[PDB]
């Protein structure tokens, strides 16, 4: 049951028609997330999941339009009928409102009870069909939910907040960290309740307090994102996955996203959203929008956003930057940024379901850095002659030992140790000996009338003068890395 203001915006014959729809909804008081998420789901289906166009199907129709050179020729965008999307929309509303009874739960001064929210979660929980033995992609949107009843972990949380909007509940909102989503609610908006899975132990109906308390990356020591309705649109925008298969991405779904991120950027709703500022910078690198800022400019906004709004406890802000440096073959600035990545992670404790960030750290230490160094060593006969890199490298390994400290699980093992020695070896003994490790002479500075380094970790302190030697001790370091 949409408004006539919404209905006249259709049909969506192009990306610009979608971008237009999204702009109009942002200007309204409560943006219709259900509508918007369906539109993203619809278009993505044809643009990525099932590109083949049917024969004897009057319901659907496509719009020809020139494609850019070198490719040239035309491209056929799926025209969103109002008749199609109106039906889908009304099924969801009828499903949710048919499933629940709002007049039972007396929201005394608009107070949605924890009782009430657990029901809405359970309505989404009982109707879904989970892809267990396969990792299905493109199962994020309410299109996927209404059509196939398949949703990824994060999409379940989003689906609840959709239903909460479908029942007029303004106070229920999507919470998320860098790799997990739940719901945030209350009068002052400080309740937490799990509404999904992660990878595992099924725990819905609980607060996220124990997660915060144990200093795990998945919950960010409390410094996670609380979304207003406008930020929830930026999430569904970010959830667009253009990949047809492993190595190919759809150009239309790129442009669609890249355009839609800029719109939000202008309206100001990427201000408290670091990961979105990185994704737009990643897109700018691939295809730079004409008359717009640079990736670096956009990456540094995401860093400051995390520093100001999120207590400088986010990790990906720095990794976004180092990757750009890495793909540009600027070896000094990349390690520097990976050392800054270590600065944040040192003050965590590695718990079991912080799986995703380990994988990223592992790849830097054991694939990307040695790749860059193998390039650098071949390029030499320089960043290897430049002693500033080795100070950054040691501080990157420093934070991972410190990360590991205070955990129930070990981080480092023999597999890691090989590449440390390989990377250590890439710098000459003349270069590495110049670095000075000190405790500190005097604290502070005052207004009156070689390069320094400092380890926080026990392990790097344990091998202080082993790292600085003339000839490398490959056997001894491997052992001293691992400990109880
Ligand atoms: C990406 C899907 N997604 C989640 O995985 C997710 C789901 C949740 F529940 C919570 C958070 C979540 O993470 C993100 N939340 N908001 C925005 N983006 C998220 N992504 C997570 C992975 C991501 C962004 C990309 N990662 C970076 C790599 C970028 C590499 N690029 C593409 C290369 C460019 O080369 C030209 C970092 C490793 C640096 C961070 C959300 C959007 C539904
Ligand atoms: Na630690």
Short mmCIF file of N, CA, C and O in Angstrom, two decimals, residues 366-461:
data_model
loop_
_atom_site.label_atom_id
_atom_site.label_comp_id
_atom_site.label_asym_id
_atom_site.label_seq_id
_atom_site.Cartn_x
_atom_site.Cartn_y
_atom_site.Cartn_z
N UNK A 366 51.93 -13.05 5.01
CA UNK A 366 52.40 -14.26 4.31
C UNK A 366 52.15 -14.33 2.80
O UNK A 366 52.53 -15.32 2.17
N UNK A 367 51.51 -13.31 2.21
CA UNK A 367 51.28 -13.27 0.75
C UNK A 367 51.55 -11.90 0.09
O UNK A 367 52.27 -11.84 -0.91
N UNK A 368 50.98 -10.83 0.64
CA UNK A 368 51.02 -9.49 0.01
C UNK A 368 52.36 -8.78 0.24
O UNK A 368 52.94 -8.23 -0.70
N UNK A 369 52.82 -8.77 1.49
CA UNK A 369 54.12 -8.17 1.85
C UNK A 369 55.30 -8.88 1.15
O UNK A 369 56.13 -8.20 0.53
N UNK A 370 55.39 -10.23 1.24
CA UNK A 370 56.47 -10.93 0.50
C UNK A 370 56.39 -10.79 -1.02
O UNK A 370 57.43 -10.77 -1.69
N UNK A 371 55.17 -10.70 -1.56
CA UNK A 371 54.96 -10.35 -2.97
C UNK A 371 55.57 -8.98 -3.29
O UNK A 371 56.36 -8.86 -4.22
N UNK A 372 55.20 -7.97 -2.50
CA UNK A 372 55.77 -6.61 -2.61
C UNK A 372 57.30 -6.57 -2.44
O UNK A 372 57.98 -5.77 -3.10
N UNK A 373 57.82 -7.41 -1.55
CA UNK A 373 59.27 -7.50 -1.30
C UNK A 373 60.02 -8.24 -2.41
O UNK A 373 61.13 -7.86 -2.77
N UNK A 374 59.41 -9.31 -2.94
CA UNK A 374 59.95 -10.02 -4.10
C UNK A 374 60.00 -9.11 -5.33
O UNK A 374 60.96 -9.16 -6.10
N UNK A 375 58.97 -8.29 -5.49
CA UNK A 375 58.96 -7.20 -6.49
C UNK A 375 60.07 -6.18 -6.21
O UNK A 375 60.79 -5.79 -7.12
N UNK A 376 60.17 -5.76 -4.95
CA UNK A 376 61.16 -4.76 -4.51
C UNK A 376 62.62 -5.22 -4.69
O UNK A 376 63.46 -4.44 -5.14
N UNK A 377 62.89 -6.47 -4.33
CA UNK A 377 64.23 -7.06 -4.46
C UNK A 377 64.65 -7.23 -5.92
O UNK A 377 65.80 -6.98 -6.27
N UNK A 378 63.70 -7.66 -6.75
CA UNK A 378 63.89 -7.71 -8.21
C UNK A 378 64.02 -6.31 -8.82
O UNK A 378 64.83 -6.10 -9.72
N UNK A 379 63.22 -5.36 -8.31
CA UNK A 379 63.29 -3.96 -8.75
C UNK A 379 64.59 -3.25 -8.35
O UNK A 379 65.00 -2.30 -9.02
N UNK A 380 65.24 -3.71 -7.27
CA UNK A 380 66.49 -3.11 -6.79
C UNK A 380 67.66 -3.31 -7.76
O UNK A 380 68.15 -2.33 -8.34
N UNK A 381 68.10 -4.55 -7.93
CA UNK A 381 69.27 -4.87 -8.76
C UNK A 381 68.96 -4.75 -10.25
O UNK A 381 69.33 -3.77 -10.90
N UNK A 382 65.33 3.17 -3.44
CA UNK A 382 64.71 1.87 -3.18
C UNK A 382 64.17 1.77 -1.76
O UNK A 382 64.77 2.30 -0.82
N UNK A 383 63.05 1.06 -1.61
CA UNK A 383 62.40 0.85 -0.31
C UNK A 383 63.18 -0.10 0.60
O UNK A 383 63.08 0.00 1.82
N UNK A 384 63.96 -1.00 0.00
CA UNK A 384 64.81 -1.92 0.77
C UNK A 384 66.03 -1.20 1.36
O UNK A 384 66.39 -1.43 2.52
N UNK A 385 66.66 -0.35 0.56
CA UNK A 385 67.73 0.53 1.06
C UNK A 385 67.21 1.54 2.09
O UNK A 385 67.92 1.88 3.04
N UNK A 386 65.97 2.00 1.89
CA UNK A 386 65.31 2.94 2.80
C UNK A 386 64.96 2.25 4.14
O UNK A 386 64.13 1.34 4.16
N UNK A 387 65.58 2.69 5.26
CA UNK A 387 65.39 2.01 6.54
C UNK A 387 64.05 2.26 7.26
O UNK A 387 63.77 1.60 8.27
N UNK A 388 63.23 3.19 6.76
CA UNK A 388 61.91 3.48 7.34
C UNK A 388 60.91 2.33 7.23
O UNK A 388 59.98 2.24 8.04
N UNK A 389 61.08 1.46 6.23
CA UNK A 389 60.20 0.31 6.02
C UNK A 389 60.33 -0.76 7.10
O UNK A 389 59.32 -1.32 7.55
N UNK A 390 61.57 -1.06 7.51
CA UNK A 390 61.83 -2.09 8.52
C UNK A 390 61.28 -1.72 9.91
O UNK A 390 60.84 -2.60 10.66
N UNK A 391 61.32 -0.44 10.25
CA UNK A 391 60.69 0.08 11.47
C UNK A 391 59.18 -0.15 11.46
O UNK A 391 58.59 -0.50 12.49
N UNK A 392 58.56 0.05 10.30
CA UNK A 392 57.13 -0.21 10.10
C UNK A 392 56.80 -1.71 10.13
O UNK A 392 55.77 -2.10 10.68
N UNK A 393 57.67 -2.54 9.55
CA UNK A 393 57.47 -4.00 9.51
C UNK A 393 57.47 -4.62 10.90
O UNK A 393 56.57 -5.38 11.24
N UNK A 394 58.50 -4.31 11.69
CA UNK A 394 58.60 -4.80 13.07
C UNK A 394 57.40 -4.39 13.94
O UNK A 394 56.92 -5.19 14.75
N UNK A 395 56.93 -3.16 13.77
CA UNK A 395 55.75 -2.66 14.49
C UNK A 395 54.43 -3.33 14.05
O UNK A 395 53.46 -3.36 14.81
N UNK A 396 54.41 -3.84 12.82
CA UNK A 396 53.29 -4.65 12.31
C UNK A 396 53.25 -6.04 12.97
O UNK A 396 52.18 -6.52 13.34
N UNK A 397 54.41 -6.67 13.09
CA UNK A 397 54.54 -7.93 13.85
C UNK A 397 54.40 -7.73 15.37
O UNK A 397 54.00 -8.66 16.09
N UNK A 398 54.73 -6.53 15.85
CA UNK A 398 54.59 -6.15 17.27
C UNK A 398 53.14 -6.18 17.77
O UNK A 398 52.86 -6.71 18.84
N UNK A 399 52.24 -5.60 16.98
CA UNK A 399 50.82 -5.54 17.33
C UNK A 399 50.08 -6.87 17.31
O UNK A 399 49.06 -7.01 17.98
N UNK A 400 50.59 -7.84 16.55
CA UNK A 400 49.94 -9.16 16.40
C UNK A 400 50.25 -10.07 17.60
O UNK A 400 49.39 -10.84 18.04
N UNK A 401 51.48 -9.99 18.10
CA UNK A 401 51.85 -10.61 19.38
C UNK A 401 51.05 -9.99 20.53
O UNK A 401 50.58 -10.70 21.43
N UNK A 402 50.90 -8.66 20.50
CA UNK A 402 50.12 -7.92 21.49
C UNK A 402 48.61 -8.23 21.37
O UNK A 402 47.90 -8.28 22.39
N UNK A 403 48.14 -8.42 20.14
CA UNK A 403 46.77 -8.86 19.88
C UNK A 403 46.54 -10.21 20.56
O UNK A 403 45.62 -10.36 21.37
N UNK A 404 47.42 -11.16 20.24
CA UNK A 404 47.43 -12.51 20.81
C UNK A 404 47.45 -12.53 22.34
O UNK A 404 46.82 -13.39 22.96
N UNK A 405 48.18 -11.60 22.95
CA UNK A 405 48.26 -11.50 24.41
C UNK A 405 46.89 -11.26 25.04
O UNK A 405 46.15 -10.36 24.62
N UNK A 406 46.56 -12.08 26.04
CA UNK A 406 45.27 -12.04 26.73
C UNK A 406 44.13 -12.77 26.04
O UNK A 406 42.96 -12.47 26.31
N UNK A 407 44.45 -13.73 25.17
CA UNK A 407 43.45 -14.49 24.40
C UNK A 407 43.35 -15.94 24.89
O UNK A 407 44.30 -16.45 25.48
N UNK A 408 42.21 -16.61 24.64
CA UNK A 408 42.09 -18.05 24.89
C UNK A 408 42.72 -18.93 23.79
O UNK A 408 42.97 -20.12 24.04
N UNK A 409 42.95 -18.36 22.61
CA UNK A 409 43.48 -19.08 21.44
C UNK A 409 44.84 -18.49 21.04
O UNK A 409 45.06 -17.29 21.22
N UNK A 410 45.76 -19.33 20.51
CA UNK A 410 46.99 -18.79 19.91
C UNK A 410 46.77 -18.24 18.49
O UNK A 410 45.90 -18.73 17.76
N UNK A 411 47.57 -17.24 18.13
CA UNK A 411 47.51 -16.57 16.82
C UNK A 411 48.67 -17.08 15.96
O UNK A 411 48.44 -17.64 14.88
N UNK A 412 49.89 -16.87 16.44
CA UNK A 412 51.10 -17.19 15.69
C UNK A 412 51.49 -18.67 15.77
O UNK A 412 51.28 -19.32 16.79
N UNK A 413 52.05 -19.17 14.67
CA UNK A 413 52.56 -20.55 14.60
C UNK A 413 53.61 -20.64 13.47
O UNK A 413 53.97 -19.62 12.88
N UNK A 414 54.11 -21.85 13.19
CA UNK A 414 55.29 -22.05 12.31
C UNK A 414 55.10 -21.46 10.90
O UNK A 414 56.03 -20.86 10.35
N UNK A 415 53.91 -21.66 10.33
CA UNK A 415 53.53 -21.07 9.03
C UNK A 415 53.80 -19.58 8.86
O UNK A 415 54.24 -19.14 7.80
N UNK A 416 53.55 -18.81 9.92
CA UNK A 416 53.84 -17.37 9.94
C UNK A 416 55.34 -17.09 9.92
O UNK A 416 55.80 -16.24 9.15
N UNK A 417 56.07 -17.81 10.76
CA UNK A 417 57.50 -17.56 11.03
C UNK A 417 58.42 -17.56 9.80
O UNK A 417 59.39 -16.80 9.76
N UNK A 418 58.12 -18.42 8.83
CA UNK A 418 58.90 -18.52 7.58
C UNK A 418 58.98 -17.19 6.82
O UNK A 418 60.05 -16.78 6.38
N UNK A 419 57.83 -16.53 6.69
CA UNK A 419 57.71 -15.31 5.88
C UNK A 419 58.28 -14.07 6.58
O UNK A 419 58.73 -13.13 5.92
N UNK A 420 58.24 -14.07 7.91
CA UNK A 420 58.93 -13.07 8.73
C UNK A 420 60.43 -13.05 8.42
O UNK A 420 61.00 -11.99 8.15
N UNK A 421 61.05 -14.23 8.46
CA UNK A 421 62.48 -14.42 8.15
C UNK A 421 62.79 -14.07 6.69
O UNK A 421 63.82 -13.45 6.41
N UNK A 422 61.92 -14.48 5.78
CA UNK A 422 62.03 -14.13 4.36
C UNK A 422 62.02 -12.61 4.20
O UNK A 422 62.91 -12.06 3.56
N UNK A 423 61.02 -11.96 4.80
CA UNK A 423 60.88 -10.50 4.76
C UNK A 423 62.01 -9.75 5.47
O UNK A 423 62.49 -8.73 4.98
N UNK A 424 62.42 -10.27 6.63
CA UNK A 424 63.61 -9.78 7.35
C UNK A 424 64.86 -9.80 6.46
O UNK A 424 65.60 -8.83 6.39
N UNK A 425 65.06 -10.93 5.78
CA UNK A 425 66.18 -11.13 4.87
C UNK A 425 66.23 -10.19 3.68
O UNK A 425 67.32 -9.93 3.15
N UNK A 426 65.08 -9.67 3.25
CA UNK A 426 65.00 -8.73 2.12
C UNK A 426 65.72 -7.40 2.39
O UNK A 426 66.19 -6.75 1.45
N UNK A 427 65.80 -7.00 3.66
CA UNK A 427 66.63 -5.86 4.08
C UNK A 427 68.04 -6.35 4.42
O UNK A 427 68.20 -7.41 5.03
N UNK A 428 69.05 -5.57 4.03
CA UNK A 428 70.45 -5.88 4.36
C UNK A 428 70.74 -5.62 5.83
O UNK A 428 70.05 -4.83 6.48
N UNK A 429 71.78 -6.27 6.35
CA UNK A 429 72.22 -6.09 7.74
C UNK A 429 72.68 -4.68 8.07
O UNK A 429 72.51 -4.22 9.20
N UNK A 430 73.28 -4.01 7.08
CA UNK A 430 73.65 -2.59 7.19
C UNK A 430 72.43 -1.69 7.44
O UNK A 430 72.50 -0.75 8.22
N UNK A 431 71.33 -2.01 6.76
CA UNK A 431 70.08 -1.24 6.87
C UNK A 431 69.39 -1.50 8.22
O UNK A 431 69.02 -0.55 8.91
N UNK A 432 69.22 -2.78 8.57
CA UNK A 432 68.51 -3.18 9.80
C UNK A 432 69.21 -2.81 11.11
O UNK A 432 68.55 -2.63 12.13
N UNK A 433 70.55 -2.72 11.08
CA UNK A 433 71.33 -2.34 12.27
C UNK A 433 71.17 -0.87 12.69
O UNK A 433 71.36 -0.54 13.86
N UNK A 434 70.80 -0.01 11.74
CA UNK A 434 70.58 1.42 12.01
C UNK A 434 69.40 1.72 12.95
O UNK A 434 69.40 2.75 13.62
N UNK A 435 68.41 0.81 12.99
CA UNK A 435 67.21 1.00 13.81
C UNK A 435 67.55 0.87 15.30
O UNK A 435 68.32 -0.01 15.70
N UNK A 436 66.96 1.76 16.11
CA UNK A 436 67.21 1.83 17.55
C UNK A 436 65.92 1.52 18.31
O UNK A 436 64.92 2.21 18.12
N UNK A 437 65.95 0.48 19.14
CA UNK A 437 64.83 0.14 20.02
C UNK A 437 65.14 0.73 21.40
O UNK A 437 66.17 0.40 21.99
N UNK A 438 64.25 1.59 21.90
CA UNK A 438 64.41 2.22 23.22
C UNK A 438 63.12 2.16 24.03
O UNK A 438 62.03 2.01 23.48
N UNK A 439 63.27 2.30 25.35
CA UNK A 439 62.14 2.39 26.27
C UNK A 439 61.57 3.80 26.26
O UNK A 439 60.37 3.98 26.04
N UNK A 440 62.44 4.78 26.49
CA UNK A 440 62.06 6.20 26.50
C UNK A 440 62.86 6.96 27.54
O UNK A 440 62.96 6.52 28.69
N UNK A 441 63.43 8.10 27.14
CA UNK A 441 64.29 8.90 28.02
C UNK A 441 63.44 9.68 29.04
O UNK A 441 63.57 9.46 30.25
N UNK A 442 62.58 10.56 28.54
CA UNK A 442 61.71 11.41 29.37
C UNK A 442 60.33 11.59 28.74
O UNK A 442 60.19 11.59 27.51
N UNK A 443 59.32 11.77 29.59
CA UNK A 443 57.92 11.86 29.17
C UNK A 443 57.50 13.30 28.87
O UNK A 443 57.85 14.22 29.61
N UNK A 444 56.74 13.47 27.78
CA UNK A 444 56.16 14.77 27.43
C UNK A 444 57.09 15.75 26.74
O UNK A 444 58.23 15.41 26.40
N UNK A 445 56.57 16.95 26.52
CA UNK A 445 57.32 18.08 25.96
C UNK A 445 56.86 19.37 26.65
O UNK A 445 55.81 19.37 27.30
N UNK A 446 57.63 20.45 26.50
CA UNK A 446 57.37 21.70 27.23
C UNK A 446 57.78 22.98 26.51
O UNK A 446 58.72 22.98 25.71
N UNK A 447 57.07 24.07 26.83
CA UNK A 447 57.36 25.42 26.34
C UNK A 447 57.93 26.25 27.50
O UNK A 447 57.22 26.55 28.46
N UNK A 448 59.20 26.63 27.39
CA UNK A 448 59.93 27.31 28.46
C UNK A 448 60.16 28.80 28.23
O UNK A 448 59.32 29.46 27.61
N UNK A 449 61.28 29.35 28.75
CA UNK A 449 61.60 30.77 28.53
C UNK A 449 61.91 31.09 27.06
O UNK A 449 62.25 32.22 26.74
N UNK A 450 69.78 6.95 14.28
CA UNK A 450 68.74 6.30 13.49
C UNK A 450 67.31 6.56 13.96
O UNK A 450 67.10 7.29 14.93
N UNK A 451 66.32 5.95 13.27
CA UNK A 451 64.91 6.12 13.64
C UNK A 451 64.52 5.25 14.83
O UNK A 451 64.85 4.06 14.87
N UNK A 452 63.81 5.84 15.79
CA UNK A 452 63.45 5.18 17.05
C UNK A 452 62.30 4.19 16.84
O UNK A 452 61.44 4.39 15.98
N UNK A 453 62.30 3.12 17.65
CA UNK A 453 61.19 2.17 17.71
C UNK A 453 60.97 1.72 19.15
O UNK A 453 61.86 1.85 20.00
N UNK A 454 59.76 1.23 19.44
CA UNK A 454 59.39 0.76 20.77
C UNK A 454 58.35 -0.35 20.65
O UNK A 454 57.30 -0.14 20.05
N UNK A 455 58.65 -1.52 21.23
CA UNK A 455 57.72 -2.65 21.26
C UNK A 455 56.85 -2.62 22.52
O UNK A 455 57.32 -2.29 23.61
N UNK A 456 55.57 -2.98 22.34
CA UNK A 456 54.65 -3.24 23.45
C UNK A 456 54.57 -4.74 23.81
O UNK A 456 54.36 -5.08 24.98
N UNK A 457 54.76 -5.61 22.82
CA UNK A 457 54.59 -7.06 23.00
C UNK A 457 55.76 -7.73 23.71
O UNK A 457 56.92 -7.33 23.54
N UNK A 458 55.45 -8.78 24.47
CA UNK A 458 56.45 -9.56 25.22
C UNK A 458 57.40 -10.33 24.31
O UNK A 458 58.58 -10.49 24.64
N UNK A 459 56.89 -10.81 23.18
CA UNK A 459 57.64 -11.67 22.26
C UNK A 459 58.70 -10.91 21.45
O UNK A 459 59.83 -11.40 21.33
N UNK A 460 58.34 -9.73 20.94
CA UNK A 460 59.28 -8.87 20.21
C UNK A 460 60.33 -8.26 21.14
O UNK A 460 61.47 -8.05 20.73
N UNK A 461 59.93 -7.97 22.38
CA UNK A 461 60.88 -7.68 23.46
C UNK A 461 61.81 -8.87 23.74
O UNK A 461 63.01 -8.68 23.96
#
